[PDB]
Structures are given as structure tokens and as C-alpha cells.
């Protein structure tokens, strides 16, 4: 899901379409940044955070 | 013309690019003294009909909403006999069983749209070609 | 020192051309709006401070 | 037996009624037609 | 009014600065501020050149 | 003369007007012109409305408009229509090139004058300028106030794009918000406006450009009909700032003091009852009692009324999707029955 939502926003920023946005993913790995695994239950949610 | 050209309603290149014997030979026409000569005229005339979506397409519903049709009329003019309608055509000739299909469905949208909306009949169609004067009629 | 400072002019170089900023440069360009003089620390209250 | 399977049928058995005309254009042009 | 408030972090107030006053220093009015990676890979760039 | 039809939401007003406008084509279908002025997203709604009459299914006397629409029409009569237009990246292109050829006669914009989003916000505040009626010579011209040096400096170098543009266009070229200044003053001159009946519906607010061309057709006209959805407004004085109606009333007031102006015959409609909300208890509770402190709670049931909570905007409007569902397949409704408003569309329209 959050695969999705971060397509849409790295698409409305500087990498659009398929091509720029593999090389931007790819570029930010392989210089050790990363992403966050995404997220279930919310902050707000009943939960032991 | 030259008054439309001073009204900024036709331009410069369009107003030389204007045959005036080709549109003062529809006036010296049948159909076009009869329209100088008519009870009540009138022009560019725009039109929205409202035609059910199974006479377009098949499958449509009577529930199902009509398509609306929309155009602009360019003449009509009422006679002791009737009301005619009038249109312009820039067609290329210089033919007739040619030009006459080309624009039926046209025609009988026109004609339909008058009908239905002014309840009134419509006697006659008549379509007038700049190139040799021609007028046909429907 | 002439390195790192060459590399700050070119990075802000890069940036202004695709029009975008740092976190960094939230805060140096504010203060830059924000300051109309500046001697050795002393700052002077442009017309947007004020 | 479950409690929800006649439903569950007849929801994923169900058409539009009217799903012909969801996609026809309203507007039409002389041209058009 | 606590919409418009100026409650926030002290970015977000500089963020707001440099929208009104972007044309007192060299700025575009539409400017957008980079994410970690797309600003950290243009600096990879410039200081490969 | 005018006639100001005034109600609340789901009064009847447009209703109301269609079937005027359907009455009045049916006792004359080649009568004196019919206008019907809407906002733009209202206009192929009204011609579909008014098209679905069994009587009639269509008509010929009347016709919808937009501003844009009507200065169209206007002007491909009584001419001016000729001369080229110009997009507003056109606008923009050409502020640009004015600029490079005058940012150094700036006395603000001069290090701004370098960026391309500069341009865009020019183009904005100018395309403002002639939406309310502000020459370049009035921008010009402009209780001390604390920003009043900067704002002249603006202002000023404002005015130099601004003069140079109007300059620049001058016997060539057509500014897109000029239409409209073109239209006010042609419809003078044109003889369809002279015996036609206007109504004017779904307008909240008018720009002075826009209030020019009513007031034109206040006085060639034969009759105007202004709708308005507000209760009981007041000619006497502009409404006040936390008020429900506060832009309808203003456009009330406005209207009124200048249809007074021009000494016109006036007539008051105000529509009372609901009419949309007859049959559902909850949302004429909702309708009525909206404004009101302290608001009289609900005493009834609840079917009609859902507040509903999403986990995120996907389960938002997969939530809504089967709803949606629900209401086509058990409650009888059909899809045209129903409609989705956000107030920040884009953060939907992909996903929806
Ligand atoms: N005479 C009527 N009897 C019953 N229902 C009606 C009548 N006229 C209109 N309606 C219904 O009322 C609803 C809206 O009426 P409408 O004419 O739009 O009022 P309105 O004043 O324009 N509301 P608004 O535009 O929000 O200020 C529609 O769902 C119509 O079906
Ligand atoms: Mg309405």
C-alpha cells in the first residue's frame, strides 16, 4: 500500500514516471538510506508504542 | 462587409477573402426571394433537443435519460404557406444526390428540433452552395 | 576549509536551480530575510523583522 | 449452511440495471451522431 | 483564528518567512523543500563534480 | 426591472426558474430572447434540465450562459471577437519578456525578478487587477499603516509590468479578463439583450467586472431575475462578519443599492419552506438549525444522517464505494443520484 502512496508522492515532486522513479529508489539504496517498514494500527489507535 | 470589418466582426484577411457575386446571387434565387419576402425571419438560431437514448442507441431505457443534441440553425423564415428552413454551405461542387446525403441526417435533425420544440411543421428545406449558386431542397 | 566551503556554494548552486531547500536552509535563509545588517554577530532588524 | 450464503449469491450474481448507459455521453453533436 | 495561528515548530514559522519574503533574498516564490534523499543526492552530485 | 428571488438552500429557487423558463417557452417558442446566466459548472446541467420537458423536450427561445459564454455570443454580433487572444501562459511569456527589459527600473522585485514562479504571481495579481476593475493608472495612483513604503514599492513596480503590458497588447492582442469589459460595454448595442428575459442562479459572489455586465443588463434588458440563497437579507446594510450568509447577502445588498440606483421596478420573492428536504426530517434539522447557537439537538431517529470514520483516506472511500453499493443494489437509487465533494479534491482524485 504505502509502495502506492509513496509512487504518488516521489511522482509529484521530481522523479514521475516509472523510469525516474526506479533510478531514484535505486540511487537512495545504494548509498545506504532507507524507508520505514509501513504502519498497521495508528498512533491514536489502542496500542503499546 | 466593409462595415463588418469596421465592427472588428470580420477581419482583415477574412474580409478579402470574400466572393461577393458568389452571396449576392443567392439573393437573385427562388428560395432567397421568398426569404426577403417572408411575414417573420430570423437567423443564427441555436437549439438543444432532447432525443431519448434508444433512438441513438439500442439498448437504452425509458427511465434512462435523453441525449441532448445541440447545434445552430442558420435560417428560417415564415411564409402564407408555411415555415422554411435555410442553411449555408461553403461545399466544393465545381453532386447533388452527393450533397444531399451528406447532410440529411442533418437536415432532419433541424427539422425534428423545429417540430418538437416550436410544435409547429416544417414545409421545405433549403440549402444554399456559395460555389455556382446552387440551392437544393429537402 | 576552501574545499567544504566550495562545495556549500555549489550545493546551494544545485538547489536554487531545481528550486528547492534544506531543513538547513529553513533556518539561513530566515534569518537571512530577517537580518538587513550584520556586523561580527551584531544583527541589525530588516523590514520583515520589523 | 452458513447464515449469509443466499446473499452472498445473489450480491455477487447482481448487475447494474442500467450499466449500458453509464458510459453513453449525454451531449451529442450534429456531427456526433 | 487557530487555523491561521502561528503555533508550530520554529521551521514551520521560517517556512512561512520565506513564503512572504522569498523576493529579499535570492528565492523562488514556489519553492518546495527537498526530502532527506532527492536534497542528499544532489549534494552526492555536486561534490562528485 | 428586477426581481430578487431570495431563500435558503433547498427553497425551490431553481426549480422555480426552470419552470419558468419552461412555461415562458411554451406559450412563445420564437419569442423575445431568453438568458439563463449560471457559473460555468452549472451550464450543461441547466440546458439538460430545461430539455426535459414532456411538453417541449428542447428549446430554441431560450438559452444558458456563462459570462464567458454570453461575451461570446455578444461580441460575435456586435464584434470585437476578431482580435487574437491570449492564454495565461501567453500573459506569462510576455511579463517575462518585460521584465528582462525592465527589472532594472524595480525598486522590490528587481532580485525576484530572476525566478519563473515570479511571473506566475505577477500574471495572478494582474489577471486580479482586471477582474476588479483597476487600470494600470489606478494601481498607479496606490490611516498610516506599517507596510504602506513596501506595498508602494510593489505596487509600483507592479504598475510599470503592468502599463507595459496594456502597452504591449494595445490595437494587437486581447488579455483573457477583457472579455467580460468588452461584453459591458456591447450589450448597449445589441438588440437581442433589449427585449430578453435574464435569470441570473448559482452565483454566490460577482467581481466588479462581472457586476458592470449585470448592471448593463439591469438597464437594456427587459427584465432580471437575481436568485440568491440566503434568509431574509438586508438592503439597508452589509451583513456581518460571522454570519451564515455573509457573501450572498453582500452580493444582496450590492445588487439592490444598485438596481435602486438606476431607479428600477423591484420585486421581493422570498421562499420560506423547504422544498428538497420535505420527506427527510434529519437534514432539514440539519439545514435549519446549522447557524443557530445553541443549536436544539435531534429528538428523532437516525437513518438519513451518517458521520462516519475512516482509518485512512483508501478505507474512506472503499468504505463509501460499498455504501455506494448498498444504495444501488438495496435502497433503489442509481449512480446519477449520487455525489462526492471534497474540499481538497487531490488528495482523492487518484485514489478515487
Ligand atoms: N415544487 C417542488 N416540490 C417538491 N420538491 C421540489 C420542488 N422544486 C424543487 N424541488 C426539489 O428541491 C431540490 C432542490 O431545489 P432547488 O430548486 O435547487 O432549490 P435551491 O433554492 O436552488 N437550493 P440551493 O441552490 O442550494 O440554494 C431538488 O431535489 C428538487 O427535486
Ligand atoms: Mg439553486
Given at each position: 500500500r504505502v509502495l502506492y502512496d509513496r509512487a504518488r508522492q516521489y511522482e509529484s515532486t521530481a522523479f514521475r514516471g516509472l523510469f525516474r522513479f526506479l533510478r531514484f529508489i535505486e540511487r537512495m539504496q545504494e548509498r545506504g538510506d532507507d524507508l520505514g517498514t509501513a504502519r498497521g494500527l495508528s498512533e491514536q489507535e489502542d496500542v503499546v508504542r | 462587409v466593409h462595415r463588418l470589418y469596421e465592427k472588428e466582426l470580420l477581419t482583415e484577411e477574412q474580409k478579402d477573402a470574400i466572393d461577393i457575386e458568389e452571396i449576392v446571387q443567392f439573393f437573385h434565387t427562388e428560395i432567397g426571394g421568398q426569404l426577403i419576402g417572408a411575414k417573420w425571419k430570423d437567423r443564427e438560431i441555436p437549439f438543444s433537443l432532447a432525443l431519448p437514448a434508444k433512438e441513438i442507441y439500442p439498448d437504452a431505457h425509458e427511465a434512462d435519460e435523453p441525449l441532448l443534441v445541440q447545434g445552430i440553425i442558420d435560417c428560417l423564415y415564415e411564409t402564407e404557406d408555411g415555415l422554411y428552413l435555410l442553411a449555408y454551405k461553403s461545399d466544393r461542387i465545381e453532386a447533388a444526390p452527393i450533397l444531399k446525403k451528406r447532410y440529411e441526417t442533418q437536415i432532419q435533425l433541424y427539422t425534428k428540433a423545429v417540430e418538437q420544440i416550436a410544435k409547429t411543421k416544417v414545409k421545405g428545406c433549403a440549402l444554399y452552395f456559395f460555389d455556382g449558386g446552387h440551392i437544393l431542397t429537402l | 576549509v576552501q574545499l567544504v566551503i566550495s562545495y556549500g556554494k555549489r550545493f546551494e548552486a544545485a538547489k536554487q536551480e531545481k528550486s528547492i531547500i534544506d531543513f538547513s536552509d529553513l533556518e539561513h535563509y530566515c534569518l537571512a530575510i530577517l537580518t538587513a545588517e550584520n556586523d561580527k554577530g551584531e544583527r541589525e532588524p530588516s523590514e520583515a523583522a520589523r | 449452511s452458513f447464515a449469509f450464503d443466499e446473499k452472498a449469491r445473489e450480491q455477487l450474481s447482481w448487475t447494474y440495471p442500467?450499466?449500458?448507459?453509464?458510459?453513453?455521453?449525454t451531449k451529442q453533436s450534429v456531427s456526433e451522431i | 483564528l487557530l487555523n491561521r495561528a502561528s503555533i508550530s515548530t520554529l521551521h514551520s514559522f521560517c517556512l512561512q518567512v520565506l513564503k512572504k519574503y522569498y523576493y529579499l533574498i535570492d528565492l523562488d516564490p514556489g519553492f518546495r523543500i527537498a526530502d532527506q534523499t532527492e536534497g542528499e543526492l544532489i549534494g552526492d552530485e555536486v561534490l562528485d563534480e | 426591472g428586477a426581481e430578487f428571488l431570495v431563500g435558503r438552500s433547498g427553497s425551490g429557487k431553481t426549480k422555480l426558474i426552470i419552470n419558468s423558463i419552461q412555461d415562458e417557452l411554451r406559450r412563445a417558442p420564437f419569442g423575445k430572447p431568453i438568458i439563463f446566466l449560471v457559473p460555468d459548472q452549472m451550464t450543461f446541467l441547466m440546458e439538460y434540465e430545461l430539455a426535459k420537458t414532456p411538453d417541449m423536450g428542447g428549446m430554441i427561445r431560450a438559452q444558458v450562459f456563462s459570462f464567458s459564454r454570453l461575451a461570446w455570443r455578444v461580441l460575435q454580433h456586435?464584434?470585437?471577437?476578431?482580435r487574437p487572444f491570449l492564454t495565461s501562459t501567453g500573459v506569462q511569456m510576455l511579463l517575462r519578456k518585460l521584465i528582462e527589459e525592465?527589472?532594472?527600473?524595480?525598486?522590490?522585485?528587481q532580485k525576484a525578478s530572476d525566478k519563473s514562479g515570479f511571473t506566475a504571481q505577477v500574471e495572478r495579481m494582474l489577471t486580479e487587477f482586471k477582474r476588479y476593475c483597476l487600470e494600470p493608472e489606478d494601481i498607479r495612483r496606490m490611516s498610516e499603516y506599517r507596510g504602506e513604503r513596501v506595498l508602494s514599492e510593489k505596487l509600483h513596480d507592479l504598475s510599470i509590468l503592468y502599463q507595459q503590458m496594456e502597452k504591449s497588447l494595445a490595437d494587437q492582442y486581447l488579455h483573457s479578463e477583457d472579455y467580460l469589459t468588452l461584453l459591458a460595454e456591447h450589450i448597449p448595442l445589441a438588440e437581442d439583450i433589449k427585449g430578453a428575459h435574464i435569470y441570473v442562479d448559482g452565483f454566490y459572489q460577482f467581481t466588479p467586472q462581472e457586476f458592470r455586465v449585470l448592471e448593463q443588463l439591469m438597464v437594456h434588458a427587459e427584465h432580471i431575475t437575481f436568485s440568491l440563497t440566503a434568509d431574509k437579507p438586508s438592503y439597508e446594510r452589509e451583513p456581518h462578519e460571522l454570519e451564515l450568509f455573509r457573501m450572498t447577502g453582500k452580493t444582496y445588498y450590492r445588487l439592490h443599492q444598485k438596481a435602486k440606483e438606476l431607479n428600477l421596478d423591484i420585486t421581493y420573492k422570498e421562499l420560506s419552506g423547504t422544498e428538497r428536504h420535505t420527506k427527510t426530517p434529519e437534514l432539514a434539522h440539519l439545514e435549519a438549525q446549522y447557524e443557530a447557537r445553541p443549536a436544539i439537538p435531534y429528538a428523532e431517529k437516525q437513518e438519513a444522517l451518517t458521520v462516519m470514520q475512516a482509518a485512512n483516506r483508501r478505507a474512506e472511500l472503499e468504505g463509501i464505494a460499498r455504501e455506494i453499493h448498498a444504495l444501488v443494489r438495496?435502497?433503489?437509487?442509481?449512480?446519477?443520484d449520487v455525489a462526492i465533494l471534497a474540499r481538497q479534491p487531490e488528495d482523492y482524485k487518484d485514489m478515487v
Open positions: - | - | - | 442500467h450499466q449500458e448507459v453509464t458510459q453513453i455521453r | - | 456586435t464584434g470585437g471577437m476578431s525592465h527589472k532594472q527600473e524595480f525598486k522590490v522585485y438495496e435502497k433503489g437509487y442509481r449512480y446519477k
